[PDB]
Design a protein around this ligand. Structure first.
Ligand SMILES: *[C@@H]1O[C@H](CO)[C@@H](O[C@@H]2O[C@H](CO)[C@@H](O)[C@H](O)[C@H]2NC(C)=O)[C@H](O)[C@H]1NC(C)=O
Ligand SMILES: [Zn+2]
Length: 393
């Protein structure tokens, strides 16, 4: 692709075309429409695109939810191309594109983007959805009723997040240059008084933020954005930054069972075209190294003694119980991003004693797949109200 901006027509175009020229390993669809009839295109890239496949983890990149934050819109289109055209020629990337099913959403709020005609670094007519709402302040909140008009895009995504067993994510932003991990909101129980809101998996989230930023020359600088605040190593907790109520990152992790972190890829929210090559350049390796992380820890499926995948069962590590507990999918498989170390998973099938099953998670993988571990229970065999769970917790 070319390195200029790609409003709706041309970006859409690109996509549809990538659709044709590479149908063997791509699939484009739409999880919904803006409040303006604009399309929420997603492009999946995988060995067998179009259908989740037991074993291969699902991965996404949502970007442009803030109208005016354009770098990510463009990085995702360009990431897209990279992958299709690297497929087959570059081995490592090919091994990856094989081993995973990558879904890309270049622009969750296109009405916002289109809206601005006079580009700018700190403010604009875009950002908010067409009803002036902040799409990253519009999701259910596990901390304090975010009673607000759920918007088309917000909803489209919620359902979409339901359509697949997404394992690892990251929604792109501009306006700062840092990688923010959860929770973006908090409670004393999580340590709001220390100006920090930690997750059961703060270590994997930290490792994940660092993964991405360590690979961004500037994001790594820490002392980078002028009119903005800066961070060390380019990573930070959401709360230690700014308690964010009703954000997608928190949602994905609470109710959607997947890990999302926020990538703040540019100081200047809507930079000049001439700068994209550089933006592509200072992010390339970071997008790839991040996606690649969808293979941390273990995965597998769970069956009863008649070798039948029991879905909806709870499978989580001994001391990592989630507010809304992680269950298996319709295929009874389970995915748990974890760091190198020895674990104990408690398989608790409804109305049963939790089943122990121990696993040592390697310490360097030679392939692009998590550790596989199937569970045979020695017997036989709705999510959570989207209401502030942690509050009264
Ligand atoms: C990665 O997946 C690709 C799928 O495109 C594999 O390559 C193709 O494999 C088919 C087998 O049905 C061959 O007929 C094609 O010639 C291959 N396409 C080309 C030229 O790349 C590839 O072998 C896989 N590599 C792995 C498993 O690492
Ligand atoms: Zn933003």
């Amino acid at each position: 692709l070319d390195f200029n901006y790609h409003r709706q027509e041309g970006m859409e175009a690109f996509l549809k075309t990538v659709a044709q020229n590479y149908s063997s390993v791509t699939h484009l669809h739409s999880i919904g429409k803006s409040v303006k009839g604009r399309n929420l295109w997603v492009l999946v890239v995988g060995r067998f695109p179009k259908e989740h496949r037991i074993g291969i983890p699902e991965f996404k990149y949502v970007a442009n939810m803030h109208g005016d934050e354009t770098v990510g819109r463009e990085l995702l289109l360009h990431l897209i191309d990279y992958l299709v055209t690297s497929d087959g020629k570059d081995p490592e990337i090919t091994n990856l594109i094989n081993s995973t099913r990558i879904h890309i959403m270049p622009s969750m709020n296109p009405d916002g983007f289109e809206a601005v005609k006079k580009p700018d670094c700190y403010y604009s007519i875009g950002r908010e959805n067409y009803n002036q709402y902040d799409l990253n302040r519009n999701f259910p909140d596990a901390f304090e009723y975010n009673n607000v008009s759920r918007q088309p895009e917000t909803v489209a995504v919620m359902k979409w997040l339901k359509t697949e067993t997404f394992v690892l994510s990251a929604n792109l932003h501009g306006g700062a240059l840092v990688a923010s991990y959860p929770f973006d909101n908090g409670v004393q129980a999580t340590g709001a008084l220390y100006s920090r809101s930690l997750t059961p998996d703060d270590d994997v989230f930290q490792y994940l933020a660092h993964t991405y930023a360590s690979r961004n020359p500037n994001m790594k600088k820490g002392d980078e954005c002028k009119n903005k605040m800066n961070f060390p190593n380019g990573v930070t907790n959401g709360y230690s930054w700014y308690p964010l109520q009703g954000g997608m990152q928190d949602y994905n992790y609470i109710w959607a069972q997947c890990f999302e972190i926020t990538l703040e890829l540019s100081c200047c929210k809507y930079p000049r075209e001439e700068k994209l090559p550089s933006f592509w350049n200072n992010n390339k390796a970071s997008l790839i190294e991040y996606i690649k992380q969808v293979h941390l820890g273990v995965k597998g499926q769970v069956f009863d003694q008649n070798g039948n995948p029991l879905p909806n069962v709870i499978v989580e590590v001994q001391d990592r119980k989630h507010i809304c507990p992680y269950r298996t999918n319709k295929y009874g498989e389970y995915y748990l991003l974890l760091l190198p170390g020895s674990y104990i998973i408690n398989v608790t099938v409804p109305g049963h004693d939790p089943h122990i099953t121990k696993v040592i998670i390697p310490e360097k993988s030679q392939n692009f797949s998590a550790l596989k571990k199937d569970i045979l229970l020695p017997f036989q065999g709705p999510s959570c109200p989207m209401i502030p769970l942690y509050r009264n917790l």
